[PDB]
Design a protein around this nucleic acid. Structure first.
Ligand SMILES: [Zn+2]
Length: 96
DNA sequence: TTCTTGGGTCTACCGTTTAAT
DNA sequence: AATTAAACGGTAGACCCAAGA
């Protein structure tokens, strides 16, 4: 048996692994809902994890791994951190 | 039967914007 | 002006599940 792409496949298969459609409505989990139990398992494993989009920052010399840590140290909102970084009245800048 | 794939369904936390003070 | 909350928009990684191998 041959896949539409040209490679051989078992007669029990509809396509080769690479050509299988899994996007949108063709996904095996499309339109399914996760149970409250699954959501909790995901919740516990994620608690305390910082994401990859964090920005190291220097607050005029005092550095932080992310803007949120700086917000928590100064006790201000994250929005204000961004505001000071853009302000000509502060020397707060992201590293890189 | 098991092991592998890989993208839809989620969570926790980020950072930037903007309405409202 | 300088502030905050909430609206938006993003990442990786855990989960699920059917079908390829
Ligand atoms: Zn193919």
């Amino acid at each position: 048996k041959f896949c539409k792409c040209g490679v051989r496949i078992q007669t029990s298969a509809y396509t080769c692994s690479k050509c299988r459609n899994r996007s949108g409505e063709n996904n095996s989990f499309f339109n399914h809902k996760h149970s409250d139990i699954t959501k909790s398992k995901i919740s516990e494993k994620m608690k305390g994890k910082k994401p990859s989009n964090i920005k190291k920052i220097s607050c005029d010399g005092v550095i932080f791994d992310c803007a949120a840590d700086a917000a928590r140290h100064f006790k201000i909102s994250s929005g204000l951190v961004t505001y000071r970084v853009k302000s000509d009245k502060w020397n707060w800048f992201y590293i890189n």
